[model samples]
Target: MLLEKAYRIKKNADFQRIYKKGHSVANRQFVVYTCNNKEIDHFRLGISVSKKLGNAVLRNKIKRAIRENFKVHKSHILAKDIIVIARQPAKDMTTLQIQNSLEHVLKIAKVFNKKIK
Candidate 1:
């Protein structure tokens, strides 16, 4: 399995580049942004769990859930930079539920284009 590191954007400028240049798709749990960069062949990801979603623990849990979900399906996604922003409703969900929700969203985003094994 491919274990990918997140390309976290701490600066507003980086986020602006992604937000303005990238394409996005939203679901109930997350809004995913993608921008193609020609330098790399591997996928890079970033996640944002807003303060309005919940407490620190809740936000961490949601982030963990999203990361785990991505880890499990990394091979199916396109090689690009991805950003996942959690929605408020994600705070109330469990890890498994969040994983499922993320999977559904990825499908809608056409990020899971490979045939399931």
Candidate 2:
């Protein structure tokens, strides 16, 4: 599914704010930062892919995987700003690997609703 534009975190300042105020979960594939945003009606997504992780091709692939996985799990998330940073290990991961890892992080971060899980 294609996520709506309102659900995207677009600005560097927004990313900085979330990184400064958010709590995070670190896993082998990704480091996910999350913070509640009462002002927004839905969860928002932001992706960060480090240059050290890979070349542009690999980084773009990781971003696509993350976004696609998030699309599948969007309904389970709380109203918050979410920033997903790609770790080096994620460069070699396939789409299914990305999906499972992201969901695992979301569960641990308590973003996914238990009632739905």
Candidate 3:
């Protein structure tokens, strides 16, 4: 499943903002960064799977897993811009495990806050 099209970070500037200006939350598989951006009414997301993780195939797999996880829980997220950076350990995990790790980080970051409801 795809998260609503509104929740995609499309510009280099957007990625820069999240990487340079956002706050971070690290878990086992992902390091998430989030920033409040009033330009959009819905959440926008970006994924970064670095060379430290693996080659293109492994990187894309990690991203796909993260995207799927986000789609499943999109409704709980707040209206903001978010970035998920994949760690090397994630390359060894299954998609379901990655999704669970992402959900845990979201909870810890209070990303699923009641106010968003």
Question: Which is the better candidate, 1 or 2, if ranked by lDDT?
Answer: 2
TM-score of each model, in listed order: 0.76, 0.81, 0.79
lDDT of 3 by residue, 2-84 (tens): 54656778888878876777777878877877776444566777778768877777787778887797776677676677667
Q: How are the candidates ranked when ordered by lDDT, highest leading?
A: 2, 3, 1
Every model's Cα RMSD, please?
Answer: 3.4, 3.1, 3.9
lDDT of 3: 0.71
Per-residue accuracy of model 2 over 1-117 as CA lDDT, tens digit each: 555756678877777876787788867877788877444555767888877877787787778887797776777676677667887778787666766667666666556666244
lDDT of 3 at 82: 66
lDDT for residue 52 in candidate 1, whole number 0-100: 89
Which digits, one per residue and each the tens of the lDDT, describe model 1 over residues 18-90?
5887777778866777666433355556778777888887787778888797777766666566667777778
In model 2, how many backbone clashes occur?
0
Pairwise lDDT winner, candidates 1 and 3? 3
lDDT of each: 0.68, 0.72, 0.71
Error of 1 at 107 (Å): 1.8
